[model samples]
Target chain A: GTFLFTSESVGEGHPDKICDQISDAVLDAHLQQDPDAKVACETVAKTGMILLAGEITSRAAVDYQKVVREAVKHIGYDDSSKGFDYKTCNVLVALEQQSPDIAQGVHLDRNEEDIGAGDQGLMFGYATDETEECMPLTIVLAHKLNAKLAELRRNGTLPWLRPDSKTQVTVQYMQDRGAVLPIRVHTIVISVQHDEEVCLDEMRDALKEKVIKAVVPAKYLDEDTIYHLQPSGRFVIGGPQGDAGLTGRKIIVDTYGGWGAHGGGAFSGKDYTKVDRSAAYAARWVAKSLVKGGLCRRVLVQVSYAIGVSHPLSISIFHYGTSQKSERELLEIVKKNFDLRPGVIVRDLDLKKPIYQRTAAYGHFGRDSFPWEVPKKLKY
Target chain B: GTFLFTSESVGEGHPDKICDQISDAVLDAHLQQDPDAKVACETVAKTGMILLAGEITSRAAVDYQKVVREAVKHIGYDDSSKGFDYKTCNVLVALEQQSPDIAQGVHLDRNEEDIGAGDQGLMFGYATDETEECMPLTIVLAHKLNAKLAELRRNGTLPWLRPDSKTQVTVQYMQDRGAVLPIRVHTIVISVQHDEEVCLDEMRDALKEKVIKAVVPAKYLDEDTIYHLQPSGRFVIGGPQGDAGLTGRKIIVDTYGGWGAHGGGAFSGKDYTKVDRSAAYAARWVAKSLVKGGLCRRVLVQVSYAIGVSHPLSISIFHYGTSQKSERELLEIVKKNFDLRPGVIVRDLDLKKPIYQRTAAYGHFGRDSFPWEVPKKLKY
Candidate 1:
């Protein structure tokens, strides 16, 4: 059977990604100064202002204004003429300490659950041998295009290319014996912002060659690859000026493009104690191990937690009927092998650090540089 | 194979949901007066202020401040002493007309694709026979508890309960031949905002008897069903006053609650032209039609569109090996039957009305009141 699947990625300059970067930067600032800190910083950007609000409890003092500007500038949004500027955008902070009631859930107590889950939510992790990185081909290509766009922009090759951009890749896939195979790159869509001077025709030619050709492999792309470069046309008034952005809004983009499932829990701006972040990272590790360990060609791992409960209420896995072993056997092995508790996962991954800012943009999974992406020799 | 899965739901007063409601209310105001209007109203709430921002292209003269207050008041937040007060909160407006650059892609022209998709993205819709409405029992129960929480609060059954709350349900599932069966409720966690005067012990008792017992059926509840009512303890300080709220932040909760997949696109605030909202509803309609049409016991439908393309670049479905017929055959039948183009979906579903407000909270799917929830008869 043949079908098509698509996954999308956003550049660091996307309005939503900007807020994510800001929120994660704030979290990084706190963690850098105090690893035992709790920061659930949420950021909102629109027009010429970025408003920061959420719960925070830490011993370290952080200059949130400084971090926001640095994050904005680093994301290639320093010029105000195009939309948002790091120097010009007003940064307002409205943070409060964690409520005693809520903090009690995450507090280190004398319970079997050493430190309880911060909230009751579901987080999912997925992996597939669709690409070299075990990520879906569409999302992998999507991220490479956007990341290459930034690379070209920052290197002054695409001088006209602005900060904000989005990349979508659609791939045609077909089923074989018991697995799905990527047939070809069916379509590629890039809606990128640019300086006022560049024309659409010029942008199209360069994007096809420099951006698309440089990133997507020739094997997957064929003569029929439909390209919609800057499909929306003329995105000069993009970024926060054209729309509003909020932290955790790009949960799907941040995770596995539509290939995996989501429990709706968003990662970023939260401390390691939050199961939303730590547990999600752990789930990815487990899924990646299964795929990399020759247990399955694809897998979707899920874990649910209740506040004041350190252990997962449920640990589930789906192999899409592609697993070599039984799902129950693999699930039980992973359940016994993986210490998914918040504290254990945090310590296992060395999560309490200033590493979050890097995961704010692009897809959080697939990149091997992250600690969670490191291959683990699974038990049994 | 036996496994467990979970899904969560948030009350209208939850911080993120508050922003979703506000954004949709603004969209509804435009659609009610000017059906041809375009809106992408994003909202953010923190402390005592609710800031509204996003692109707007409507002839309707909407008093955004009044609409915000009305939405807030309707959500059961009116007392300033309990953190947020609708009458006293600040509502700032910062909306711009649709960017001419971006709008160019949507304008009808010589395009066989009469109306192009507003943006490039993917959307998914899923259905299962695990419940009466073809939704996962975990999410359906999760929403019922939260909706019942609001019901109890508004009806004075729980006068001390506040507006903000969360509900999570964990369900053990077992594989039965080709399909999956929901075994029983494994765990239930509800953390509801309440008055400072009510003790945790008293809140827990009432939550179990009045909230859980009223909603959950006896068949699903057993001796091992664990309940963590108000697990985080007192939630006196909640809502936007305690945590920040942003439109589209709760995308997973609004959709299939992790049962189905997500393409990262959110539903609230956007107009009918945006595929993120309308196509999602359309996808759900397609999925529900297939399930109700007896094509499969469960299915996941996916559609991807490139900006300025009227038709989906790809239409795919996953039956998880649970379909009686081959996926290729069913997909072709749907490819010819369903009109997934942006404009046709809006017209078929009548998505231009002021119906978006009701979809801002709880689970957007599984509710028969919405047009998308209606079963569509599939063509032979």
Candidate 2:
């Protein structure tokens, strides 16, 4: 018998990703001036408008409007005829200083363990041998497809394609009566925004030949594999014109798709002081390192924190019944090898730098280029 | 050996919940006038401002500003002194008609299976017998604490307590050599915003006596239980004034609270036509029915759909090795018993009504009142 699992990804021009990039860009601008800047920026994208709101406490003297326009321009939304324009869209910023009450807790104190978590929340990280990057196979493929769609649009490979696009991949896991360790592609769905002048049949054929064939593994696409191209036809009005997007709305797409649990916290815009961003990265570091060390075929790491507390409330790992070491034993090794404190995580991962804008789009975990995805030496 | 797991919840005044309530309030307003209204409203809140965006196609005539103010007032942000005011905050609305391209795919067709999914995405549902509500114990406890904090504020039981608050519960699961079910509480953390005039020590004492003692079960509170009260001290500034909040930002808190996986689709403000809302509810219905029918102590249900396709691409279930029946058998039973098409799910769940405002706050599951939580008779 076979079981089906699915995951999805959106392109950089997606309304939600547009807001994510804007938020991260703002944070980077502040961090470039003050690495210790405390920020919790959030962005909302709608027709002809971008709203920036959240808390920030820094000495940076950056122009928010300039940063926002640059971000939108970078995402290829400069033409007013495309429904939203980088130069003309309204940019309203309503940022406030970080509350003193929250600042009191996160600030370093005389005691060695005095740097507390900025907020109370939970975060999760996961890895599997099903993909080369230790990410779930479906999510990796979906992200690659979405990135390729954007690449084709930018490079004139698909001149009719628009910016906003979505991609989904469904994998079928099969096993013999006594066998394990295998999954196959059952279906694929790719919907890319395009001009109304393009013929539907021709667009489908072009997508199959250029995007799908270029990204997905041929072995996974058997004769039975179902492909859905442009399910919703004539997607001319998109990119915040057809809908709305907000920062942190794509938590699942940003992380593991549906392969792992989420703490429900979003990563874009917030500084490392916030446990939601810093601890999540640290958890991925731990999960990737454990698998890189050959400790498990699949792993999920969960860590929680209380506001103003340096120590994690809990740290647990699960290996889907495939690990030789018990979860408790793995927890001990993880605690020793990884410093779970918010301040230490920020420093150890070199997260204070202005490199988050590139991560706002594409899946964050599977790309080995991110510092958090970099494999660290395991103590075990 | 013992392992720990944690989950958290936030009060109605939490910034994200404020935006969620606003979004749903708009949705309910339209639904009340026209049950078939198509909407996908989104909201963002920051210091003294609220922005509404998204697509809506309906005959219902409603005032967006009134809806936003009423929602904010209901969340206890009516006072200007609290850093945000329902009456004074700027209300900006940038809503457009639903994209015709999407409408073409979702509109009812002559064929029985022609009402395609509104979008392409994944959704998840889960249940566990660890609690009476068939949800995980720690999340249930956390939600109760958060709701109690709000109740105390509204009922004048804790006049000094403000609207913004967060609750976290960490449970330690112990296993004897042959035992399968044993979980205990190891730590609890509660942080509530309050008036500056209140003394820190007095607030802690009052909370311990009133909030903590009233909510947590006595069995879970042992001698070794660690309690963190106001971990971040002097919490006067809070709500949208403290941090920006966006609709769909609290997907984790709105659902299982990290106890189970999520497909990352949000629920607030979306009409029944959106699979992100309707199919997720359908998934929960399936999981709840299976658990109630004595099939397993725990279960997870996942389903994925492609835009403009009525049938799901994949449907799968996991019972955590606790089920007497194999997942393959369960899958057949599920397929036979449930109609997961978007149109069928919407009608079966009675979702085209003004009942979403209450669901916007508190956990969406665990409450038997929601149609999705109502257990159905299982076929096998």
Candidate 3:
């Protein structure tokens, strides 16, 4: 086995993670009532309505219909027995304001010289010590078995699970002297949603001994992995009554799934001075401070932005030759310890907080209770 | 230019490419009246309805409501003065039938042994001899200036165009040894839609000398490229009445702006046993036959699928250090001349045609009238 990499995760009733948690629950209720909120709102859930539109400059009065019924009753979908009920749907919105010529290249009457970058585009930041948070051990174990099958179907501990799901892992990748190891486990597609008398070989033998042998790790399962549960036998007509959800349409399961290189701006309901969510959280805080400053076994860090403006029109790095230095001196030490600018990456990653409804499920760059997951060890 | 890559594109009245050209014009009129049509249509458009949703086995009976009103009158939004009006919207559809337990994993017992994989996920295929249709020269000059601003707003050569639009390009790579070398002329964003009495600085000075200097190539523009026309100034309340369009929400502007790597399966309304459309067209015919069989100057490949599985649970290839044949012997001649299964990639990419409503608006692998734009000397 040599060379294969994979990643995927979706739940919180998928349909693009329910319009990315209904646009990060309206950027967590306008950064919990104005942490300098200026959003970009975009959402499009289906089956009976929910389509809030973009652009906003905020002083934050947002109820926005109680932030879309508390992100569809925290994903259990306010019951009309799940044909997408969210308290009897229809949300509309088209949220306006923030087009003062696209807020003069990102509000610059000198807010610490923000100086443009709200929308040109280009963003990438990835890390991969292959796990223990340099992420990408098959998408961090398929986003921890899709966050343990959405915390065992939102705490009913898999009481016939339901509430849509999906996992997928795949990973084999060999090639030793040339790097890339992750030896085995070559398949594990999940697809949860249940409760119609659940037996398809007793739900594929309880998702092969409870969700892919309880979130993988049987020494990377030999015997050719492949555990295709719910290979379409019964998904109980899953989410948004069989698909339709959009909001930055799962930007590669919200980051680093197709294992690196993506700058297709989409981070749920942008606000963090929209450099696609502050330059992808400042290129994941400069690839987690250049792999916590050991300077890479893997790091991706790419940057750019333009509309409304705030600096980063460019910055780049890629180290996976296990760089000890000299990729232009580690991008000049990531431009001397990052200030890739959208108002200094929303004040150096504190990102005006209400922490994105927990980064709209399972990803937003290798998790760690989010503040761009700072595994610190930085040095200039 | 150390590194920063980003990609985006839209227009042809985007509401997710008008629900991805009404699900690739109902999978191109069910591949022009059943080219062995086993289609999976999905659509969602907004503000005045367009529904359609998935699942189909297709013994073919065409005219899905005149293929969603001629794919919304060929995307000029057949006028409610373009607030979205293919003869007054509303379409509905649901469609169903195809799920005989997901057609026993993509029809087997030998009807050309269809086998499986119309789900599960992962799919990526990229090439880069930097645009000799090995594509990606800033998404081929941003899909040729977004298909020449929808053919100069449909032949009036810019009757103040309209029907939404957006485009971006930011090249300047220049790495050389690891070889990126786009070298200068970086930014160029375009946001179109007009005729509310034009004149936004004379439509940005006639779209910078008529649509960005008639599509770049005066040696790729000097004066450091920079162009931003209509970077969101009065875009006259653009298409899908300014947002909410869903069909595979512009999967990286339908392939390659975020240059490469995206196994997040989406190819306008899946069919061809959806390995997100025939293992991403058999990983772009095994990365243009391993870079025209010299075996990799730039390749990416990536494969995966599960839903009813006819193989490919994984197939990787990266070659970015530009392979001189050792990316494991180019993944062993792409698993020995690629039959990446899904019924041999829908019969080696002839994929039951309906030329996907012109591949849902611009950029679906280097367009020379699609069928995944054949040549790399017909895959070596």
Candidate 4:
């Protein structure tokens, strides 16, 4: 009774991922200038325009146009005909102050209590040995393809390559009856955007020959592997031209590969002061640390929050019977070792940098090139 | 051991929820004008402006201003000084034509062999007998409170009530060993925006007496109930004035309230041609039918799609160990009983109608109000 778990990732040029990058870039800028800044940014991108709205409370002045332009251009939204050239795309930022009622709980007279959570919301994080970064295998492989697709476009390897690309991967988990390990992989799917000059047949064959073949390891793929690339003839119209894109639309891709579970709080567009952004970051850190510690083969962590509260209402860890350590011992150890508080999590993860713009695409976790990618930092 | 699962929901007047409603209203109007019209509408709201953008391909010419004004006014954003009054606030619509490559598979040519998915993505659907609608209790009750809070504000029942409101409900699911369930209520958190002139103490007492007590049935209430009303005090500066709002930011609230997993696909501001929107609706219909077909106590259905492909790459169901038949046996039945392709799902779900406006706020699964709610009639 083997099962199948799937997850998908979108490239940076993709409309939604582009908006996510802008939102996070705003967060990074606000935080870089003022670490204590309270920020909640949301981005909406369609056609030749980008609209940003949310709340921000800080002492530093930010050139929002600069923040958005740098992020958009970096994502390869450079062409004018794609209908959303980075420089030409109108950027409308409408940011205000945080609600006083909501702000009261996080701001205090003392430094310790002053670091209150931006909002009341639950967050979760997870990691597994399915991939090198402890992320699910299907998503890990898919993200690698997306990252490379964007790279090829930016580097002019595929001069016709567009920023908007998406990849979907499904793994047939090894469902062993009455056995310890639960699942393994059977199939994979990849799709990317290319210029009109490339014929559909040629594009499909080339992606299979290069991008797909290069990213997915040989051990997981075989002759029976399925390849469904740009099944359509042409994909010349892309980026914001293809559709409207907004921030925080790719939550599943950001975390799990649909292998485990999700807490439903989206990352990007908010500073670490917000639990939705910070706590989720910490949850991944915890899950990664636990797996690195060799305590479990699989894990899913869930945390809940309430407004005006400093601590989480609940924290649940699910190892799905994969814990090598006793459940009771692991729970005790986690409670004593992890600081699930929002303020502490921001500090612990070193989340006050301008690295968020890079995290908005091709999946959030499992990117070994990013700051949160702590392969060697995890300790038992 | 007692475990807690919390989920929150917002009122129709809340800034983000307002954006959700406007986007859906656009969908509904388009459907009313042309049942087969393709529409993708996304909305964002701030102090004195409401912005809309997406792709549209249809013969019908919709009056965008009329749709937005009607939706905002209905949500009680009619006052000018409120900063986001529907009558006075500015409205900006920047929708454009959709791309043809993405629309290739969704085009009908009499022969349904290649009615491709509206978009390429993964979606999840879930069902449980936890509440009347088979929805999780936390979100169900939370949504009811927020909706009621808005109603009371408009009707002047709680004259001190302002627009923005959020509620969180936590339930303690009594499990045997695994994630098995026989749940009970644990805690409740409700935060409603209020007039600047009112006292915090009075607001809490009145809300507890009038709104929360009226909306949530006694069966779910207990002595340990915790309420955080105007927690920071002085909510006069709220709604879009206090923060910015986006259309798809509340997907969890729109679906299952974090009780089950999400496919990372957003519902609002999307047309039926996008499989991310259409297929997810179909997955819900399928999950509901399977449960009604006497397959399992609780079920989670997952499906994945690829661009320009007519059929899904994979379809899976997890019965959470509560299945009467084998997982494989049930999957076979599901395959035969339903069409998981994008075009078939749209036809089966009757998604062409302009019914999306009602789904922006509250959960989409349990509503007995919408035609998509007619899952029982589908009969697996």
Best model number under DockQ: 2
Residues B282-327, model 2: lDDT tens digits: 8988998988888877889999999888889999998777777889
Is model 2 an incorrect, acceptable, medium or high docking prediction? high
On the 0 to 100 scale, the lDDT of residue A356 in model 2 is: 85
lDDT by residue (A67-110, candidate 2, tens digit) is: 99999988888786666799999998888899887888667462
Q: Which residue pairs in model 2 clash with each other? A: none
Name model 3 segments beyond 4 Å from true. A1-124, A131-255, A258-285, A292-336, A339-380, B1-12, B24-37, B40-57, B61-69, B74-76, B79-105, B110-115, B119-162, B165-192, B196-263, B271-380
Candidate 4 chain B least-lDDT 10 residues = B371-380
DockQ of each: 0.79, 0.83, 0.19, 0.58
Count of backbone clashes for each model?
A: 0, 0, 19, 23
CA lDDT for candidate 1: 0.86
lDDT of 3 by residue, A1-380 (tens): 36667788787778778888888878778788788776777676656677776666778787777778777887887666555777778787766665554465356474754546765667788877756677778877887887777676777756777677888888776654334668888777887777777688977787788777788889998886767878767666667656656677677877878877776667888776667667877787678778767777777777766565556656767776777576678888778766787776777678777878788888887776566777655566
DockQ of 3: 0.19
Order by DockQ, highest first: 2, 1, 4, 3
lDDT digits (tens) for residues A1-380 of candidate 4: 77677778878788888888888888888877797777788888887788888888888799988988888888777777665677887888787787665676566553653465556666766777655678777787778888878777767776767777888777777643221232434555656667657787777776877787778767667776677777555677877777788787778877776666666566888877677877887777777777777787767777777765667777777676677665556666677787777667666677777777777776777764454456324333
Instruction: Tell me how far the alpha carbon of residue A228 in candidate 1 is from the true structure, in angstroms, after superposition.
Output: 0.9
TM-score of chain A of 2: 0.96
- TM-score of only chain B in every candidate structure: 0.98, 0.96, 0.44, 0.93
